[PDB]
Design a binder for this molecule. Sequence first.
Ligand SMILES: Cc1ccccc1CNc1nnnn1C
Ligand SMILES: *[C@@H]1O[C@H](CO)[C@@H](O)[C@H](O)[C@H]1NC(C)=O
Length: 341
Amino acid sequence: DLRLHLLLNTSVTCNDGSPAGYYLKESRGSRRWLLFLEGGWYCFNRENCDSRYDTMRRLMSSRDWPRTRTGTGILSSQPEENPYWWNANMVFIPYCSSDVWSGASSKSEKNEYAFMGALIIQEVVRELLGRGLSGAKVLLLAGSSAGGTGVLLNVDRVAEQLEKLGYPAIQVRGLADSGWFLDNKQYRHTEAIRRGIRYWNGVVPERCRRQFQEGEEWNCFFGYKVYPTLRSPVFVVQWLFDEAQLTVDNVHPVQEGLRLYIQNLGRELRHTLKDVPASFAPACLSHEIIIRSHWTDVQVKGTSLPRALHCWDRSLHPLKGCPVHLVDSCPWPHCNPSCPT
Ligand SMILES: Cc1ccccc1CNc1nnnn1C
Ligand SMILES: *[C@@H]1O[C@H](CO)[C@@H](O)[C@H](O)[C@H]1NC(C)=O
């Protein structure tokens, strides 16, 4: 089990002003550290956030969090469940800021809620340095869904933070799962993100900010636009037919118009990954994520995700029999036989 620690700096808070925190399981024989960002959509105005506080309160507050959590999938310490990093130091950072991990705004007399996702990540890193992170060789910042987009928005800031604090030997890398979205046309008929950024005082990576300029920071929430601006190594996991993408696209006996729409979506996603050398993109319709216990089962071209991640580790020391760029080319959901059932 991973044990809860509420942040010692209690001014770094969840939406309702309660302290943020992290769950930790140490592995003293390892210099690898995995910091995982939870997902769960976002909220973008007072009324929408009030609704989320009524029925999704754990995503807005630490008041009811349990003392422990079980590590699963890539967070499991069992070699059979996690062939990749079973012996690593494990950290799960709960998502309680509703801001895609981008915010830097406290509660005040003018703000009902605090949006501190970017500050939560930096404070977790700072407090872990005194618990053994100072001796790390690799810090892998991973996350799923909104947490996968959070990786893209925060990995370079973590690298800069450790350099400025005096830890130049720690290699910072990112693993973005299910957070690579397209700003495409809906099947049946970006603004919420634009409103959200203003509501949150949201921040984006500096090189991406300088390309798109004032008012256009929303562009940096889209993987294919922010990824080329990043300096840290980043591995991208993305289903070609992601269920969250299809939900925003208003897709739910398929006739020609919808067949062409779905085929074009897969082709567009595959195109955006052509120049991403570390990636795993199976041709599946799914909402499943990398902390599930059976994450080992899917394969692309005969290679599993735990294997591809191991090959990525070797590449950062091409490799015979150890590939890192794995994107399906078949054009319809479940044309890969290993897709989750
Ligand atoms: C970045 C993020 C994080 C969580 C939930 C949604 C989103 C962006 N929304 C969106 N826009 N076009 N497709 N999708 C899914
Ligand atoms: C706690 O965090 C806030 C926001 O990041 C910061 O202003 C403050 O200085 C921190 N306190 C300490 C003691 O570092």
